[PDB]
Amino acid sequence: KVKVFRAADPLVGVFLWGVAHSINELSQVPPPVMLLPDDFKASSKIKVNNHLFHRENLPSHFKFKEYCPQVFRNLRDRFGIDDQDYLVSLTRNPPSESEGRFLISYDRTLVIKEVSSEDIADMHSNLSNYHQYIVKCHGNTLLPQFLGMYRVSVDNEDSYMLVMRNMFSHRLPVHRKYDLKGSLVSREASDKEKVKELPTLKDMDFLNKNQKVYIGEEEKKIFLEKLKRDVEFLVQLKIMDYSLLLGIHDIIRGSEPEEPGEFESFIDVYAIRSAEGAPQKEVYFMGLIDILTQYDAKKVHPEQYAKRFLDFITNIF
Ligand SMILES: Nc1ncnc2c1ncn2[C@@H]1O[C@H](COP(=O)(O)OP(=O)(O)NP(=O)(O)O)[C@@H](O)[C@H]1O
Ligand SMILES: CC(C)c1ccccc1-c1nc(NCc2ccccn2)c2c(ccn2C)n1
């Protein structure tokens, strides 16, 4: 009559199965030092078909596809992520579902976003362009760090999943959250949004709260240098409607009790500390997103957008 209920979601369970399988398969294939053109058009497909052989945590009919496995393994290596840590981060403990289809890893190092067939097509277009860029900058970017790309099939229903390094902290929680475009038009969080514990604020909210960012000229000249060449790369690709995602962690408010002889096992690669002498001690998490890569459940000329965007972001400091 009504829909079926499960203790474990099928899609997620197949996904974590597939990642295990794919990293296991990859450990038996020496990583090339040089990627070839064909690697950007490569895929791994597996179809499981069990008759009358019933499992709890896993359906009986399902498919898993990994896109460009040698490319993403190479990206992981350039971003300083060993396949074993990736696998552990994603499978050891189950991932926490956040808001439609958007997952954080138990350790909070990785984010997993469901995306469209359309978005997979876009990913493939610029993947070789992106890999070239990552080589040039030695993985030092404010762009998303794409670590894997997969299609899960349950019920004859294809879900596309994208794995990214978390722009936010492996533990330091985020108190204030902005999406900034520097748009000619006004941008503001709805009444329905400011109603949430962590609402996605915007350009007018930032200005209306006279919000600034205090980091210190040296960490600023390091940030704006990187931001410029990242945005220049996006111009070459004729990409436009992107934002700076800005997370503020307030030091004094601190973390929940579940943060004696324990050191952080991960680095927050988009994090930058309050410089000495500043209204409040804080950590800033700043990276580049668009509608495709926004930390949310998926629902004018490039050079102008660029010049404009860099104008607005240079003024938040
Ligand atoms: N190598 C590729 N290069 C560019 N776009 C691709 C590539 N593979 C898939 N796409 C696109 O990405 C989206 C997802 O395609 P997908 O569901 O993987 O189809 P498929 O590979 O043609 N099917 P199948 O043979 O069953 O694996 C669609 O928009 C595809 O056209
Ligand atoms: C450079 C870009 C990150 C990228 C890398 C690898 C492979 C593909 C892409 C890409 N990224 C899109 N959006 C996501 C996005 C854009 C800007 C900033 C942050 N995130 C794309 C396309 C094509 C259309 N769109 C909307 N290509």
Residue numbers in the entry: 37 to 135, 139 to 298, 344 to 383, 403 to 420
The study reports:
Previous studies have shown that basal ATP turnover in the absence of PI5P is not inhibited by 1, suggesting inhibitors from this chemical series can bind to the protein simultaneously with a nucleotide. In an attempt to observe this phenomenon crystallographically, we set out to determine a ternary complex with PI5P4Kγ, 40, and the ATP derivative AMP-PNP. Once again, 40 was observed to bind mainly to the allosteric pocket in this structure, with some density for 40 in the ATP pocket (occupancy of 0.35). However, we did not observe simultaneous binding of 40 to the allosteric pocket and AMP-PNP to the ATP pocket. In addition, we have shown that exemplars such as 40 are able to engage the PI5P4Kγ target in cells and that, in X-ray costructures with PI5P4Kγ, 40 can adopt two distinct modes of inhibition, with binding to a distal lipid-binding site that is 18 Å from the ATP pocket preferred.
